[PDB]
Amino acid sequence: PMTLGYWNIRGLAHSIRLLLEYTDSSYEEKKYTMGDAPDYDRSQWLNEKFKLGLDFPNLPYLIDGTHKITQSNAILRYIARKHNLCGESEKEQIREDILENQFMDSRMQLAKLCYDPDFEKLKPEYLQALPEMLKLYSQFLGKQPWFLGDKITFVDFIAYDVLERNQVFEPSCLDAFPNLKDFISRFEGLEKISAYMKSSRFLPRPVFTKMAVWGNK
Amino acid sequence: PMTLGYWNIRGLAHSIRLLLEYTDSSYEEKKYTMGDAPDYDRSQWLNEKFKLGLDFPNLPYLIDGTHKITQSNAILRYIARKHNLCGESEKEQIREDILENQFMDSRMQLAKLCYDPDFEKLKPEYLQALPEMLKLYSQFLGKQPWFLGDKITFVDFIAYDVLERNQVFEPSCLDAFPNLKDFISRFEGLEKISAYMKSSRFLPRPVFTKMAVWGNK
Numbered sequence: 283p284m285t286l287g288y289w290n291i292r293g294l295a296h297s298i299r300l301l302l303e304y305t306d307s308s309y310e311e312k313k314y315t316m317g318d319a320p321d322y323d324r325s326q327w328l329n330e331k332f333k334l335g336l337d338f339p340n341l342p343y344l345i346d347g348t349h350k351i352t353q354s355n356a357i358l359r360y361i362a363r364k365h366n367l368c369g370e371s372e373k374e375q376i377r378e379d380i381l382e383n384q385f386m387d388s389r390m391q392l393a394k395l396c397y398d399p400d401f402e403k404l405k406p407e408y409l410q411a412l413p414e415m416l417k418l419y420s421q422f423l424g425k426q427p428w429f430l431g432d433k434i435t436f437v438d439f440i441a442y443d444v445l446e447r448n449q450v451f452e453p454s455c456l457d458a459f460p461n462l463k464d465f466i467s468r469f470e471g472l473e474k475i476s477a478y479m480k481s482s483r484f485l486p487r488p489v490f491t492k493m494a495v496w497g498n499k
Numbered sequence: 500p501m502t503l504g505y506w507n508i509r510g511l512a513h514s515i516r517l518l519l520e521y522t523d524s525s526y527e528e529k530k531y532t533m534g535d536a537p538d539y540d541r542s543q544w545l546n547e548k549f550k551l552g553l554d555f556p557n558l559p560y561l562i563d564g565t566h567k568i569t570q571s572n573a574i575l576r577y578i579a580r581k582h583n584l585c586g587e588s589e590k591e592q593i594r595e596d597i598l599e600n601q602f603m604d605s606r607m608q609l610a611k612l613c614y615d616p617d618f619e620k621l622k623p624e625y626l627q628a629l630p631e632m633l634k635l636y637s638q639f640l641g642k643q644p645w646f647l648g649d650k651i652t653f654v655d656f657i658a659y660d661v662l663e664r665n666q667v668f669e670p671s672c673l674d675a676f677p678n679l680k681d682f683i684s685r686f687e688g689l690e691k692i693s694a695y696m697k698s699s700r701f702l703p704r705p706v707f708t709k710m711a712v713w714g715n716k
């Protein structure tokens with residue numbers, strides 16, 4: 283019944299798909315396929331982009347009855363609120379807001395590099411600064427099993443996505459941080475998540491769109 | 500007592516400064532001045548970046564007692580929650596979330612253009628796509644005085660910032676949208692906002708950092 287539209291890629295829909303699975307949500311996916319170089323045909327999407335009743339047509343989008351939502355963050359919060367998967371206390375909300383935006387910045391840093399034609403030259407510099415960024419996430423998490431504390435919330439799904447994808451970009455980046463590796467293991471260990479990663483529906487690749495220099499396939 | 504730290508520019512602190520003024524908050528600002536080209540000296544900030552107790556040192560930051568916050572959105576939400584300036588119903592929260600992220604995207608589109616070395620070439624294309632962007636916000640707003648309905652909330656402060664700065668970029672951009680123009684008038688007419696705009700503390704310029712091609716001064 284619920285419809286999740288996005289490109290046939292991991293991208294910004296990864297956290298959403300994982301959350302919908304964890305919450306045992308009833309949904310189907312409308313997958314759009316972008317054409318390859320040099321045209322990068324987006325007609326499949328453009329043909330129905332303005333016919334879905336979306337206020338700000340974009341991908342990903344979630345349709346749930348009269349509720350038509352865009353903006354990955356808004357979609358995650360929407361689903362999470364339906365299952366009590368958001369911060370409750372003032373402190374929990376603060377941590378939630380900070381991380382949501384921080385992770386988005388980290389996500390953009392990786393994306394900017396991966397879409398840069400000079401990807402090769404700029405990569406050494408990225409991996410250089412990566413331990414610094416990871417250290418901050420490691421310090422914030424501490425000995426808590428999840429980012430807001432004892433209870434898993436939506437940011438943990440955003441957290442898993444950016445961290446695990448940095449691990450795919452560079453296999454050894456999380457070595458120095460046991461709690462970050464334990465976090466990944468713990469998330470992938472969850473019943474619903476483990477089952478999903480084993481199913482045919484799991485879509486870990488390609489990481490980015492066909493227009494990417496890295497992660498395009 | 501409350502401390503707001505940021506560059507001596509409008510940038511990401513505009514919405515926050517306006518919100519603090521509207522809420523009649525008690526605060527002081529720690530201003531950092533970037534050096535001019537070609538060095539763009541950032542030591543004024545870098546010399547104390549890691550001495551503030553911030554979990555993810557960044558600008559802007561807000562210090563409120565034991566509460567140290569980074570990420571403009573998280574700062575706006577923190578302040579808003581203290582003064583009943585957030586969406587309440589599920590529908591309001593959805594509009595709030597969609598707008599927060601959507602306005603951030605619009606903010607980035609303008610900044611990407613303004614920091615691009617090929618600003619002159621890319622400008623006509625931005626101005627071409629501008630009416631479409633503005634149209635969407637106009638349609639969403641409707642006849643409501645504020646973005647979430649009858650009550651003003653934090654997203655209205657984000658909205659004013661991105662809408663009004665596009666107006667500084669192109670004075671005539673809001674002409675075709677009477678409701679957006681009225682929104683701008685309405686916001687600038689609010690008691691606390693009107694008074695703040697007449698004060699010496701008001702900082703509408705420069706729009707971006709000294710590194711920008713447009714709005715650097």
Ligand SMILES: N[C@@H](CCC(=O)N[C@@H](CS)C(=O)NCC(=O)O)C(=O)O
Nearest residue numbers: 293294340341342352353354355604
């Ligand atoms: N900030 C938005 C970004 C949305 C976005 O850039 N979507 C890309 C794919 S990642 C797209 O192709 N959107 C379709 C369009 O703009 O027509 C979100 O987080 O959802």
Ligand SMILES: N[C@@H](CCC(=O)N[C@@H](CS)C(=O)NCC(=O)O)C(=O)O
Nearest residue numbers: 383387510511557558559570571572
């Ligand atoms: N997503 C962040 C972006 C923060 C950011 O880019 N801050 C720039 C000025 S706009 C800066 O100079 N940060 C200081 C630093 O990174 O050390 C926010 O919205 O607060």
